[PDB]
Amino acid sequence: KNFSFRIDELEEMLTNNRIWRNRTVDIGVVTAEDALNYGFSGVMLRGSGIQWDL
Amino acid sequence: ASKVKQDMPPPGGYGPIDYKRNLPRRGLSGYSMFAVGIGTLLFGYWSMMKWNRERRRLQIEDFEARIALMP
Questions:
Q1: How many Cβ atoms are within 10 Å of B18's Cβ, its own excluded?
Q2: Is residue B26 within 8 Å of A13, Cβ to Cβ?
Q3: Could you tell me which residues come within 8 angstroms of residue A4 by beta carbon, excluding any fewer than 6 positions away?
Q4: For chain B, which end, N or C, has fewer CB atoms within 10 Å of the first or last residue's CB respectively?
Q5: Other C-beta atoms lying within 10 Å of the C-beta of residue A51
Q6: For residues B45 and A32, is the Cβ–Cβ distance under 8 A?
Q7: How far is A33 from chain B (nearest CA, A)?
């Protein structure tokens, strides 16, 4: 019942920070087809728009 | 001879557990902050104008003291 506020504080620190976005946005972009062919799974799939969860 | 006792949720249930994001707006408008900045700049400009004119007058006065002492 209290973990959500900790998530909120982490998100306040990182999500909208322009330094964090400058360091993370458009870095290590992988396509859905390449992710499927390279054997990826989990978030590394779902970050490319592939709708898959075991 | 007693009841079965085990770790169980309370009768009814548990209270709701929040999980959704909470990042409140908590901010002024852009016009407000821009106006505050411009007003602060104008106040500083007026103060500095007065002070620098006074400083120029003082410099002239001590230059004239030097002129009087020069011969």
A1: 13
A2: no
A3: B17, B18, B19, B20, B22
A4: N
A5: 6
A6: no
A7: 31
Residue type, A3: F
Residue with tokens 């169980």: B8
Tell me the C-alpha distance between A8 and A6, whole Å: 5
Resolution in A: 2.6
Give the separation between CA B23 and CA B28, rounded to whole angstroms: 15
Q: How far is A5 from chain B (nearest CA, A)?
A: 8
Residue A4 to residue B23, Cβ atoms within 8 A = no
Give the chain A residue nearest B21 (alpha carbons): A8
Tokens of B58: 């003082």
Residue type (1 letter), A27: I
Strands (E), chain A: none
